């Protein structure tokens, strides 16, 4: 009961700006430690 109730609820509810959520998700991690140590000369 609990696993199926958590699976049917976890289905994406329609009418949601998934592109906006994804674009806020990709643009968020602006930490970017950029460890340039060591495969040589790769960005």
């Amino acid at each position: 009961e609990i696993a199926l109730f958590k699976y049917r609820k976890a289905r994406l509810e329609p009418g949601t700006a998934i592109g906006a959520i994804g674009a806020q998700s990709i643009g968020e991690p602006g930490t970017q430690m950029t460890l340039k140590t060591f495969s040589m000369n790769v960005t």
Binding site: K6, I21, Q24, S25, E28, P29
Partner: protein, 243 residues
Amino acid sequence: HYAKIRPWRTFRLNECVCTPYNADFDGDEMNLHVPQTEEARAEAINLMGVKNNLLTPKSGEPIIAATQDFITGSYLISHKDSFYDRATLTQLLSMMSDGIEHFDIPPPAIMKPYYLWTGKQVFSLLIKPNHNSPVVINLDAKNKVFVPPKSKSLPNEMSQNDGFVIIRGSQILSGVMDKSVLGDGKKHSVFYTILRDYGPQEAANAMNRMAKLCARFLGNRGFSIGINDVTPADDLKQKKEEL
């Protein structure tokens, strides 16, 4: 958010929700707005409420649990060795939900030679206040670091520290309340469990009865970082001098 009318014209929000705003309290201004019609007010509070937004959508972990004093004071409450007096446990249990709701005092962990409640039972009382609240949960997790159980033992609880935690029936039986057990980490905290088990309201209520607990107790316990605290010993000095 909702409104609240207090003096001393600077703003107050809370400190558990400081992580998404990334505030630093260093002269950082941060403006507010109000809706106007009756449509957009409910459109704000039912779709953008703080009880609904316990998750950042980038991976689905809880992001609003607590902050530095709350975690480091709950660690001092429930370390392994903070046996409370009945007066001290009484005051500390009343000073979380001040007078709005009651508690049922469990039998202590130690009988007739002096009755002392272990701090983990004290954190267990924080989750389940009464039998009228259906808040029974289950959890098993890890306190962000542990020395592994060096012998041939199947559980990870038989270590030099508490290590692996376990919750059976809204009761912690081993462990502390550090990071990635309380929040701001992976998806196995206590508040995430209260959320997924019994909705947003009890998840918010557990945080707002932990905040008034730990903020009011850590000012009473005491914690400082002196020059003796950051003193290198002579052994470290003579080891560095040769290494």
